[PDB]
Amino acid sequence: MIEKAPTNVEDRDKAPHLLLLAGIQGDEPGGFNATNLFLMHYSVLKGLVEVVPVLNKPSMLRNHRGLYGDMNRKFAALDKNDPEYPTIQEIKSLIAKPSIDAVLHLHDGGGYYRPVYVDAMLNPKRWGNCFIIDQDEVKGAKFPNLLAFANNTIESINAHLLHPIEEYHLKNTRTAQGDTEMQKALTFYAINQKKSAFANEASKELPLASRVFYHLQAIEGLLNQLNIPFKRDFDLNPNSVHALINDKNLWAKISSLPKMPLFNLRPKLNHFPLPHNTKIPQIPIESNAYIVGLVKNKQEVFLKYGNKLMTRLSPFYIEFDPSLEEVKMQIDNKDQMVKIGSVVEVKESFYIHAMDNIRANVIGFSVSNENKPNEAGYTIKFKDFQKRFSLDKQERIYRIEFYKNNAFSGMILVKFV
Numbered sequence: 001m002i003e004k005a006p007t008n009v010e011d012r013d014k015a016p017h018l019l020l021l022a023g024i025q026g027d028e029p030g031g032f033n034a035t036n037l038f039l040m041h042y043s044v045l046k047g048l049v050e051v052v053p054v055l056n057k058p059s060m061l062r063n064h065r066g067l068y069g070d071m072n073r074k075f076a077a078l079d080k081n082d083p084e085y086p087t088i089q090e091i092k093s094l095i096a097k098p099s100i101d102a103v104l105h106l107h108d109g110g111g112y113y114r115p116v117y118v119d120a121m122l123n124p125k126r127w128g129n130c131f132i133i134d135q136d137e138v139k140g141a142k143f144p145n146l147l148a149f150a151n152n153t154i155e156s157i158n159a160h161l162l163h164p165i166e167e168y169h170l171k172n173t174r175t176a177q178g179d180t181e182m183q184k185a186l187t188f189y190a191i192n193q194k195k196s197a198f199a200n201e202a203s204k205e206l207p208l209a210s211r212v213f214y215h216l217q218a219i220e221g222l223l224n225q226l227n228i229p230f231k232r233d234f235d236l237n238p239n240s241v242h243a244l245i246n247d248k249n250l251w252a253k254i255s256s257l258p259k260m261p262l263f264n265l266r267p268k269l270n271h272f273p274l275p276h277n278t279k280i281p282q283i284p285i286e287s288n289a290y291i292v293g294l295v296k297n298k299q300e301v302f303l304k305y306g307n308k309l310m311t312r313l314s315p316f317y318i319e320f321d322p323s324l325e326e327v328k329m330q331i332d333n334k335d336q337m338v339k340i341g342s343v344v345e346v347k348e349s350f351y352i353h354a355m356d357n358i359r360a361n362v363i364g365f366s367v368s369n370e371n372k373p374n375e376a377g378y379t380i381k382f383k384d385f386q387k388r389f390s391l392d393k394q395e396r397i398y399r400i401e402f403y404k405n406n407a408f409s410g411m412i413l414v415k416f417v
């Protein structure tokens, strides 16, 4: 759970609190890219929006609907030894918090919903591009009229259609009146705790940017109805959403290694150091996005951004010795101390000062075929690199790796600017 809050803590209780959730299925990237964009690019000025950007991360990492079954059928009867039992309890606790008023759950769904059977793509059994409630009213909720909230939100989405076929309609599933499947899903649990709960589905027939667009329209429409004031730092249109999803300023940081850009990495990174005795899902990972993770695939470790594969790591597992904190490097003529885990920009040249017991291997540079080299004490310029060893497709970014005995002391990247 990530809080989207006012900068002043006093303003939290001055408007309602919304819980926003996506990614209960790992192959519905519209939802979890929209929660990501929301987290990265919006501000909430009063009240609070609590966000779980992906409910089923393990499934997301394998581009899979659900590795342990349908997580959205686990809100009623559920076996205590179900692998997702603890996750479900966490989600139910968030939903049931007294401080929460409304819940919004994002999905991607096949085709386009219609109240009347039009054809196999457009009928009441399809889920695409609709806004969903379990009933018209929840007695005892701060905002009991779900139908009014739903219809006004739908108005707001329909003011921005990209094509008429994408028109949004209300789907009231009347869950208590015998809908067995919806009776086991998230939003029904929510209304039973007297929350106004809503679901948005964007059609899978749409490309990602358009799915996300529609999810963000639904979020904005509902926030407007709740009177949770907000801003965003961009114009909401498919192109602006596409640019923010595919944003070259996104980065990820694995363990104590340097920040690396997410987009335009070489597809495979060889001889890549990862801590030994650490399970892949436990390896610390940091990003300015919220849907990034690592996942083991055969012998490789994939870097994932939602359902996108950003690079394949071919790792070697090694002890990460934290003793080395900084290194004396000459950067464009100027000796300075560079902290392990930095990215340093280089206009012309660099040189690493020799160290007692620490050897440095600059990936892409070499003077011999020794497989465990020490390349401290060489003046290195762009011309000295074999470009194919770069981290990036643009051939500007290179790894410098430091070793002490059979331990890994850290990495610095150089970027030629």
Ligand SMILES: N[C@H](CCC[C@H](N)C(=O)O)C(=O)O
Pocket: 072, 105, 107, 109, 127, 132, 182, 185, 186, 187, 188, 198, 199, 201
């Ligand atoms: N396509 C979704 C609709 C569920 C909508 C709502 N009941 C929720 O829990 O968000 C499903 O079949 O799980």
Ligand SMILES: [Ca+2]
Pocket: 152, 155
């Ligand atoms: Ca209206």
Ligand SMILES: [Ca+2]
Pocket: 029, 208, 306, 307, 308
């Ligand atoms: Ca995708």
Ligand SMILES: [Zn+2]
Pocket: 361, 362, 363, 364, 365, 366, 373, 375
């Ligand atoms: Zn080298």
Ligand SMILES: [Zn+2]
Pocket: 371, 372
């Ligand atoms: Zn080696």
